[PDB]
Design an enzyme around this catalytic site. Structure first.
Site, PDB file in Angstrom:
ATOM      1  N   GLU A 118       0.801  70.425 124.309  1.00  0.00           N
ATOM      2  CA  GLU A 118       0.286  69.068 124.435  1.00  0.00           C
ATOM      3  C   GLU A 118       1.168  68.253 125.365  1.00  0.00           C
ATOM      4  O   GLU A 118       0.665  67.551 126.249  1.00  0.00           O
ATOM      5  CB  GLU A 118       0.174  68.444 123.040  1.00  0.00           C
ATOM      6  CG  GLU A 118      -1.029  68.967 122.229  1.00  0.00           C
ATOM      7  CD  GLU A 118      -1.053  68.545 120.777  1.00  0.00           C
ATOM      8  OE1 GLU A 118      -0.031  68.757 120.086  1.00  0.00           O
ATOM      9  OE2 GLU A 118      -2.040  67.888 120.369  1.00  0.00           O
ATOM     10  N   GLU A 138      -2.443  74.943 115.649  1.00  0.00           N
ATOM     11  CA  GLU A 138      -2.525  74.018 114.535  1.00  0.00           C
ATOM     12  C   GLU A 138      -3.692  74.372 113.625  1.00  0.00           C
ATOM     13  O   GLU A 138      -3.593  74.228 112.403  1.00  0.00           O
ATOM     14  CB  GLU A 138      -2.620  72.593 115.088  1.00  0.00           C
ATOM     15  CG  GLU A 138      -3.158  72.539 116.483  1.00  0.00           C
ATOM     16  CD  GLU A 138      -2.069  72.380 117.489  1.00  0.00           C
ATOM     17  OE1 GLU A 138      -2.209  72.874 118.611  1.00  0.00           O
ATOM     18  OE2 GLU A 138      -1.042  71.780 117.158  1.00  0.00           O
TER      19      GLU A 138
END
Lengths: 262, 262, 262, 262, 262, 262
Positions: A118, A138
């Protein structure tokens, strides 16, 4: 750059020319933490105020991993409040980096996953060593990417490729990422740092005032439709012309010489 | 096509079948000028009105420049009023070409940079020779692309690659461009025009009336979110169906024969 | 699932583990019909209600075609009332699949064009055999794609490639499609169904609660600009943390055991 | 305008000065018809082509009905094709009316309900006789306003009031409508036409070129957020300045004499 | 406030409590000037920096004119460059006022027309003396409002009323404005300044930190659809909650004492 | 409704005809609590499933308080976690009420402040007692409205009036609210419930299927610009036409008799 302020020792900043070098220094996986996230947002603010810096490069300390994503301690069980506050910090830090006025290049010297990927997505350009593997894991633990991963990944590579990584929890090698457009360039192991700095030096060669204004236009499509920005594009263009620095660039090309600005 | 109105000798249009071929004729770099921009918009308006033309092809005169971009005399320092007006001209001219009812193909036989690339971006499909190189060098001179480049390029190739060309001032060969999605197809040197006319001739084989309506739907995402357009898509489909021309295309397929329309 | 209601025998569903297998079974080209479209929409609704199913797979019966597109009987001249109604049925059916909470994987074992291609685009991930050819041929007969094709195809592959297939009526092999990003993966002939099931198995290994919430965020860009979704992205994350299931996913990684959820 | 073209005798056009007066002539309720809808859209286009007319006025034949709304003949059972087609004309008709470049003034001389209210909403400004009553009664019969009523009414008067009329089927007197913003002005019975014509003469005093450009900007919010148009507003303003007409208006105020333009 | 700063002598700044009073002092109509516009933008930025100011009031020098708008010398013919530059200045200055973190109250003591009206709109709240008349007369001279007037007026008063003022060049009294929602309150002659200061004092009684964060939310609809802002509203609420200032307000209501914050 | 469902003692539901009457029953202030928020969302969902209900009315137990706003215990200092979760329920609960397919009528029987006013804003129509006072005081306490009040209030009454209530913490009586558009109707003390129910009896007279489908169109502008919805409005109109209920309403008007549906 950032020579005078309270910055976590976990992040080390070295200034090369007009390029500020930011390295995550968290052992052994360079996992993100609340202290680093606060420092990053602050750092970006400080760097933006500095007019001597036109480019920034982010790399992971150590050979193995650029970033392992978020540290486990942050998401330690039994506190709901913590999860909320920390989602905020990733967004604020990463968006600030995304909003850096100068060009941002991420040198992926190791595998980037979760928060690590990210962060790299926040940077304008990504350069990665062949051995690094990048994925969003995730979903495997029941958490979504909360650093803007959901929006950022489809944008570069498209929804389908974005879905396989997050939805199917599948990591991608450097060759794959370059093929799908996730990473603009592929480099030999250990060369990401030099190539990023080498490229960041090229950025210093374009007009500082111009780079700062152009970057929002490119990223305007995220906020709004592209056709809407077209009137603004001409207007921004007119604003540039009302600058000392602007006349220098056109004259230099006309006379076949290197442009020189302040 | 465009047989009689005052048309700049710099732009010459020759009619083959249902395709209009437009070539920049400015020496030696074919650089854009105010007169060309005016003509281009007028030419697009005139072409839209003509119903005998289903496809458009634009190429650069000579085997070396599709387009050199904007002429320096046009941006000669340092009068601000001129700058505002030339950017306005580019936007209208490029947008008009972008909004042509028929399909627009740009055949890259030469260097296409700055304004020239932006023009090629305006075309629906781009065909480039292997030797051609495309980049936006406006950032180096402190000037942004005012022709919609800031939006158009990231849309086609993604932000990361787009920033690299504009922010890092990094030119791309034909192979990189095809790989990044900038150009749909790659051709041997000197074959772009022949390939462009050839692809354009096939488009004339699709229903005229359909092509003009279908193009807005595809470019709808730039104005607004894709999902918003779904109702309009069905409503435009039925509008196509209440036509004599639509019954012919479908009939031809049933009887396994070439469809014939006005 | 879906073994206790009225479902058309043309569409056969087989439940394997947490994956539901949907096969178009209409000979000889697996062309869509009104009966199939109604079943699809109803099927998706039943599948969403079922909590045992985490992944969805769609394949075309027979080796030669995944889907032929819409049935010819479905668009017979000259009635407009039906044409409006069939177009409505496609959108309703396709959007329902597109919004399926679980991951949807389309296994392309044969030529998929027109409606069939539109169906694959609705699916989250596409896996195709090397021989399969995909194109939108409606424009040739004067019909635009009514299944959301005008929006879905440029989104995945960009306008330039998308315009080519619809406007120029040009078919693409699996290899081009992989390069343009139309398909995530290319597989050997006859192995797409097995690979899709295998990939579907990977989705079972991610938390169900996460997958269902996460999928909307990724597709947020279609409804609105990506940046708008960022506050929601953090909010949905906190919701995930407020569950018994989420704590098991994170804790399993700390002790490096496979997560176990219900 | 509309002096020598094929137009329905139901609609009569009278040219006063620079304003064209259009009157619905359908007995006895002045209800809309396919011939009326077609004439309206065709007429509006014709008015847009004419540069002598800077304002538009719409009034209902006879004292009692401004516009009866939709004719039962149109929605007569039970053909489904009829309904889809006819809704299309209302959208085309009203949108064309809504998009007239010169100002549109709706004079409510009689009952305005259903389609009639929708028509008046299409008009830029509404002037109503004290007695006239307006409402949307389509919900009572199970029909929604398909002329944009669902969007237009809420925009002017707010969600609470608009829902009450349409969802609760509640008609409003002139006084109530003026209080809620539905009608800008209220006039004594039979003075609407004179007041609308007289208000129209005032518009001719404003620059025709300024008027045509400014009206889309005001109506920009319906297509997109207000702030988005701000760059373009400045751009169109400069476009006005590069006109012979602008210099005269700017000059005229300075001399303190009435502006003279063509 | 802003005593140790270089501001045009025309703009007078007086500080009462936490409210900063700015008066336009340009004779004889208090028309805007370039020197005035830059100061206004600059003044707003300085005010935003100061934490001692919670409210802003702007009024026109003298009883007769609140603000006359742009001076003709500013828009004097015939240079196009002058107009482009001044249009930018109005937008920048007025947008800065609109973006003042504290509440801005517009006290209309005199004629407010053209830019002056646009200036008032940029303010959050408007208080007017019965006598003041507000209109946009730019259309009469053939120039549209370039200060955001085209967007700001329909937003407050709706399109219908907005059109008449701009399109028909119709001025409105204080009562009519109050009815149409242009002005929140009407005051007796000469009481606009006192009332605005008194109203401004009340804002001091709400939390400063809350006010700054809340104000963008109300204005979020201008940037985007209201529905999109809701997740952010919850997020900002939580951010406010994580501050000492927020705990004080809750405490005050619980013990029924006045809240006390820095 | 809610004939056999699990609800907190605090909400009382009585079914009158096709209208379900929901009353907050919290002493002494009818203040919102976590238990009631859940019931609201669940109740709305159940009401949505029941086909016997066409309208909804919300009122506060006791004459004095429609709603006191949020309960003090829920936002009691100082856990950050509690506040985040409480904000989340307000949004889910109020949006659910906002999303009720049937019409929602708010009878303001008492002081409506904070959450209560936000709750009322969720309702489609508001009817208020002359003595009732409504204000948003959260800013005085340092908390913003987290129930969408920031979005809701400026939508109904405009930004200017919205800002004074929230930013200046100023309460409004019914005459003021009615004048500014906050409330559709003003009623004599104690007749709000009867008037609400009476008005709710009116919606029963309109076709249930039309009401449910029409209501999103009106509220489509909040999500997106109005012109965007016009094509869909036509499409939804056509979907209604494809129903038995639609034919019945149109007939009744032709035969001048009362419409009858199931």
């Amino acid at each position: 750059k950032a020579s005078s302020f309270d910055d976590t020792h976990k992040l080390t900043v070295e200034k090369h020319g007009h390029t500020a070098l930011i390295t995550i220094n968290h052992p052994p996986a360079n996992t993100w933490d609340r202290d680093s996230l606060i420092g990053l947002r602050q750092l970006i603010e400080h760097l933006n105020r500095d007019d001597d810096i036109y480019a920034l490069v982010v790399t992971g300390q150590g050979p193995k991993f650029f970033s392992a994503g978020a540290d486990l301690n942050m998401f330690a069980d039994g506190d709901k409040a913590r999860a909320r506050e920390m989602a905020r910090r990733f967004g604020e830090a990463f968006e600030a980096l995304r909003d850096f006025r100068g060009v941002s290049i991420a040198a992926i010297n190791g595998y980037a996953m979760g928060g690590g990927l990210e962060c790299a997505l926040a940077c304008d350009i990504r350069i990665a060593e062949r051995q690094a593997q990048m994925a969003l894991p995730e979903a495997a633990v029941g958490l979504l990417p909360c650093a803007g991963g959901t929006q950022a990944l489809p944008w570069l590579v498209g929804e389908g490729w974005a879905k396989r990584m997050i939805l199917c929890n599948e990591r991608v090698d450097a060759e794959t990422a370059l093929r799908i457009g996730l990473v603009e360039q592929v480099v030999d192991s250990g060369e990401a740092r030099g190539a990023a700095l080498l490229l960041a030096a090229k950025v210093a060669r374009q007009s500082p005032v111009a780079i700062r204004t152009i970057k929002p236009l490119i990223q305007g499509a995220r906020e709004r439709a592209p056709n809407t920005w077209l009137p603004e594009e001409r207007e921004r263009f007119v604003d540039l012309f009302d600058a000392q620095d602007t006349r220098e660039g056109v004259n230099a090309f006309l006379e076949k010489r290197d442009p020189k600005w302040r």
